[PDB]
Design a protein around this ligand. Structure first.
Ligand code: NDP
Length: 332
């Protein structure tokens, strides 16, 4: 039977429940997609604990917990195409990007939220691509315009977004500086990274200064904003350096960054907010990425799989944050 992931109250992961999902028909300009695998995102956990209640009320129409759905991306198969849509047909194997209800048996979404799956990949492999690689690409290339020979710092680089940025930075000839937790350090060293440091301490700043002779890095790809992490990031940022902030939680404003370092370009961005302004964004990024995956120059991320029945433990596993890469749920 068709189902949707819901929570009857905020604060505890235990109450994540698959509730009956009523059939929906794709109207004009709409596509119906049969969901086959869904990664758990960091923001999914935040919502489950009820930590974006204002954000969800202001920027979206979520007034109560009963209106909350889960899932920001997926892979699946087109089962219904509404009128007006010309680029899609039933049977097309697609990745979904930027929906809010991917943890459902079926979703109705725009054809602008869909890209073609690379045919040489498995469905489950392709599920590791959308948010990580589109966020990494937009931040590093679209905004920061990183070039070869440049040095880039990627924080918490064992996660989904950090792992994609690693692949992109190296393929673009940049020199990667990574930080991760101690028990993940070997794996990242073994991924092909010369400079692996601790994401859990602020002492990375001093280490970077020494490895670079005061220069620091031209680009930071950052998602850590607690304590004195932002100030420490500014210290390691070179003259004219570029600050990609993807946190979306308690970030510095443009003048606050200008107060400290006027030379640097500050790039705070929310990917789905960027699609809101330009509905072509996913299409363009993917056009610049699909050939790399086709020619096996870029690869799916490392992932662990959970069945849908164990959704709670899939969420808990991402919450404990001991993973490298992606956590992916298969659907029934
Ligand atoms: N701006 C945008 O459009 C997007 C925003 N995001 C945001 O980016 C962030 C990362 O995304 P994603 O990679 O998918 O999430 P993940 O859960 O995969 O990554 C989180 C990583 O942070 C590190 N970490 C955990 N706890 C701490 C801590 N106390 N101090 C320092 N580091 C810690 C861990 O790595 P380690 O053990 O190596 O430290 C973990 O792997 C999230 O906040 C997410 O909401 C994500 C995608 C799109």
């Amino acid at each position: 039977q068709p189902v949707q992931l819901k929570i009857a109250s905020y604060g505890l992961l235990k109450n994540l429940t698959w509730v009956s999902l009523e059939n929906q028909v794709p109207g004009v300009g709409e596509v119906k997609v049969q969901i086959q695998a869904v990664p758990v995102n960091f923001r999914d956990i935040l919502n489950a604990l009820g930590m974006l209640q204002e954000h969800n009320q202001t920027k979206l129409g979520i007034t109560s917990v009963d209106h909350l759905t889960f899932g920001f991306e997926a892979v699946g198969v087109i089962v219904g195409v509404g009128l007006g849509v010309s680029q899609w047909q039933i049977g097309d194997e697609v990745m979904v990007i930027g929906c809010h209800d991917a943890f459902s048996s079926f979703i109705i979404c725009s054809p602008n939220n869909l890209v073609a799956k690379p045919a040489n990949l498995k469905l489950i492999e392709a599920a590791t691509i959308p948010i990580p690689f589109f966020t990494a690409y937009h931040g590093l290339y679209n905004l920061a315009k990183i070039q070869s020979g440049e040095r880039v710092l990627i924080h918490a680089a064992s996660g989904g977004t950090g792992q994609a940025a690693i692949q992109l930075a190296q393929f673009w000839g940049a020199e990667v500086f990574a930080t991760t937790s101690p028990q993940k350090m070997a794996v990242l060293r073994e991924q092909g990274i010369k400079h692996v440091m601790n994401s859990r301490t602020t002492e990375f700043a001093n280490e970077i200064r020494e490895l670079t002779q005061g220069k620091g890095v031209d680009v930071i790809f950052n998602s850590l904003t607690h304590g004195e992490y932002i100030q420490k990031n500014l210290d390691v940022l070179a003259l004219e350096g570029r600050y990609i902030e993807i946190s979306k939680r308690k970030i510095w404003s443009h003048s606050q960054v200008a107060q400290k370092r006027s030379d640097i370009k500050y790039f705070p961005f929310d990917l789905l907010e960027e699609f809101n302004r330009d509905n072509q964004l996913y299409y363009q990024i993917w056009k610049k990425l699909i050939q790399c995956f086709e020619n096996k120059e870029l690869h799916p991320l490392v992932y662990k799989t959970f069945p849908n029945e164990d959704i709670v433990e899939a969420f808990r596993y991402l919450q404990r944050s001991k993973h490298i890469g992606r956590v992916v749920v298969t659907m029934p």
